[PDB]
């Protein structure tokens, strides 16, 4: 007998991010995968991935140049941080 | 007997993001995959992915230039952060 | 016997994003995939994906230039953050 | 008999990020993998990954240049830090 | 009989990040792996990973240059640090 | 009989990061691995990893240059340090 009881008595006004998970039992392969329960990506860049089988196999000349140079201002007050009876703010 | 009881007694006015999941049992392959329960992507860039089988196999000349240079201001007060009886704000 | 009871007693005025999921049992392939329960994408760019089988196989000259340079102001007060009895605002 | 009781008596207004997980039993391969319970990535860049089988197998000349040089100001007040009866703020 | 009771009596307004996990029983391979309970990555860069089988097998000339030189100011007040009745702030 | 009771009597407003884990029983391989309970990485860079089987097997000339030279100011007030009734701040 598998019993799971979570947040049974929520009183007043709490801030909660609950993620309950119960389980009873050619190039890339993923099986029985759980992902992104609470994934947060900012400025994530993948230039080349999984090009393929036999890419540039023979006589190949390749020039790769990656220049990251930008005035980007990523300003996040709260990330994955539930709050209660609080004062949160951003001032510029 | 598998019993799952979540947030049974919600009193007052809480802020909650609950994600319950119960399970009882040529190039890219994904099987039985759960993803994006709460995925948040900002400025995510993939230039080349999974080009293919035999890409640029022979006698190939390739020039790749990636120039990221932009005045972007990504301003997010709250992300994945439920709040209660709070004062949240953005001021410019 | 699989029983799942969620948010059984919602009292007052809570803010909730609940996603319950119960399961009992040539190039890209996805099987039994759950995605986008709560996916939020901002400024997500994929230049080239899955070009194909035998792309630019022989004698191919390719010039790729990616220039990201724009005055974009992405201003989001609340994202995936349910709120209650709160004051949220944006001021410019 | 497996019984799991979590956050049974939530009184007042707490801020909580709870993630309960109960389990009873050619190039890349992942099996029975749980990931991203609470993953937060900022400025994560992978230039080349999983190119493929036999890439640049013979007579290949490749020049790779990676120049990261940008005035980026990543300013995050709270990350994965739930708060209560607090005052959080950003001032410029 | 396996019984796990956590945070049974939450009184007042605590800030908690609880992660309970109970378990009863060609190149890269991962099995029964749990990861990212609370993973936070900042400025993590992998230039080349898992290139592939037989990469640059014969007669290959490769020049790799990695130049990290950028005025980036990563300013994070709180990371994975729940707080209560506190005053947290950033001032420039 | 295995019984685990944690944080049974939480009084007032504590700040806690609790992670309870109970278990009862070609190149890289990981089995039954738990990782990232609370992993925090800043400026972690891996230039080359797991290139592959037979990489640069014969007649290979490779020049590798890694130049890390950037005015980066990583300023983190609190990391993995829950606080209570405290005043934390950053001033420039």
Author numbering:
A (entry chain C), B (entry chain B), C (entry chain A), D (entry chain D), E (entry chain E), F (entry chain F): 11 to 35, 57 to 123
What did the authors write?
Each patient was heterozygous for a different mutational variant of the TTR protein (V20I, G47E and V122I, mutational sites refer to mature TTR). The first patient (TTR V20I) is a man who was diagnosed at the age of 56. He underwent cardiac surgery one year later, due to acute heart failure, but no additional symptoms were noticed. For the three fibrils we obtained spatial resolutions of 3.18 Å (V20I) 2.37 Å (G47E) and 2.99 Å (V122I), based on the 0.143 Fourier shell correlation (FSC) criterion. The other two mutations (V20I and V122I) are seen in our 3D maps and occur within the fibril cross-β structure. Yet, they exist in different chemical environments: while residue 20 is part of the N-terminal fibril protein segment and located at a buried and hydrophobic position, residue 122 is located in the C-terminal fibril protein segment and affects a solvent-exposed position. All three fibril samples contain both mutant and WT TTR protein. A superposition of the three structures shows that the fibril protein folds are virtually identical.
Systemic ATTR amyloidosis is an increasingly important protein misfolding disease that is provoked by the formation of amyloid fibrils from transthyretin protein. To investigate the relationship between mutation, disease manifestation and fibril morphology, we have determined the cryo-electron microscopy (cryo-EM) structures of several ATTR amyloid fibrils, which were isolated from the amyloidotic tissue of patients with hereditary ATTR amyloidosis. Based on cryo-EM, however, we find essentially the same fibril structure in all patients, demonstrating that the mutations do not necessarily lead to different fibril morphologies. Each molecular layer consists of two discrete density regions that correspond to two ordered segments of the fibril protein: an N-terminal segment, extending from P11 to K35, and a C-terminal segment that spans from G57 to T123 of TTR protein.
